[PDB]
């Protein structure tokens, strides 16, 4: 992680691609703002775990 | 004046009471062949169904 959102790391890339895959719904209805953020927040554990696996 | 049996019903009844005279007029139109004058083809097309003979004044 480059310690910045949308950085040039692997944690950032995965964590900014999951949000870019959920914003495709939020910007087309089908979920309110609150639901989208909750999904985004509950992904940090998965992205961080999978970023280390990919990096190493 | 304002009729008690209804304004339009008075007209309908008045037409009804004169059906016999209108029946005679319709019969005379229907049986005796009639020739009529017409200005153009559109007016000729707009003729009644008992008009057998016509004449187009060009």
């Amino acid at each position: 992680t480059t310690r910045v959102v949308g950085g040039s790391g692997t944690f950032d890339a995965l964590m900014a691609s999951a949000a870019a895959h959920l914003k495709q719904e939020f910007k087309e209805g089908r979920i309110t703002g609150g639901e989208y953020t909750k999904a985004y927040i509950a992904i940090v554990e998965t992205c961080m775990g999978n970023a280390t696996q990919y990096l190493l | 004046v304002d009729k008690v049996i209804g304004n339009a019903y008075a007209v309908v009844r008045a037409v009804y009471c004169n059906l016999g005279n209108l029946k005679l007029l319709y019969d005379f139109l229907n049986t005796y062949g009639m020739v009529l004058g017409v200005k153009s083809e559109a007016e000729l097309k707009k003729l009644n169904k008992l008009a057998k003979y016509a004449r187009v004044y060009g």
């Binding site: 087309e28 309110t32 703002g33 | 209804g6």
Partner: protein, 234 residues
């Protein structure tokens, strides 16, 4: 008397704040959900204009001989005459205030002579029955007549123009927002959004109850007891 453009903005900040179509400046609604929101405001005003007596309007209806049933639609009016669906116009409206097809309930109809004619009175010649809410059945179209029909009215239909002005009491705008929120949040079919729709809908009743518990929509009525002197009672 706010404008539909302002209603879009105030909706984007209070009720539809987490909605997807909220633009990046947060002070407007994107051009893809505007038909949806406009279809919710129009229903919202219709409900609010139905419970409370908010707009009482009268449109005079001239008598045409041979016609007894007099639908109060806009196709029969003068300024909006539609020759394809109406044989002759019989309602009367001025160009500045045309008929807007906004009759919810007909309340009291007078005549061209000043004689009040009862409504839905089976045993009452000189009575105008209404066979369906937006109609009128005068059984004797006398000569030189007309009918000032006082009726409950709804807000004129919001076409979509962002310069059309909205006739709502300022105290009832906190209830129109809570009904747009209900309609919007209840269609997503998600558990989180559905539970929010109920809260917004129940708040609609709470605000519509405080408006009727303080006479902010002119619901309480008092009249002089003219019946007293007529029945005798010196």
């Amino acid at each position: 008397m706010r404008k539909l453009s302002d209603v879009y903005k105030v909706l984007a900040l209070t009720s539809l704040k987490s909605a997807g179509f909220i633009t990046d400046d947060k002070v407007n609604i994107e051009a893809w959900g505007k038909p949806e929101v406009l279809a919710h405001i129009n229903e919202g005003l219709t409900r609010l204009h139905s419970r409370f007596v908010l707009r009482t309007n009268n449109c005079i209806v001239e008598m045409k001989e041979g016609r007894t049933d007099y639908p109060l639609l806009a196709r029969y009016s003068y300024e909006r005459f539609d020759p394809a669906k109406a044989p002759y116009p019989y309602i009367m409206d001025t160009p500045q205030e045309p008929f807007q097809e906004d009759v919810i309930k007909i309340l009291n109809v007078y005549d061209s002579k000043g004689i009040r004619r009862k409504l839905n009175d089976d045993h009452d010649k000189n009575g105008l029955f209404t066979p369906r809410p937006d109609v009128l059945q005068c059984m004797w179209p006398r000569h030189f007549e007309a009918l000032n029909v006082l009726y409950q009215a709804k807000h004129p239909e919001l076409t979509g123009d962002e310069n059309q002005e909205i006739d709502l009491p300022e105290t009832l705008y906190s209830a129109l927002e809570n009904w747009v929120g209900y309609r919007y949040h209840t269609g997503l079919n998600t558990e989180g959004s559905t539970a929010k729709a109920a809260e917004y809908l129940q708040l609609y009743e709470s605000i519509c109850g405080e408006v009727v518990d303080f006479d902010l929509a002119n619901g309480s009525m008092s009249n002089t007891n003219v019946l007293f002197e007529k029945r005798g009672w010196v």
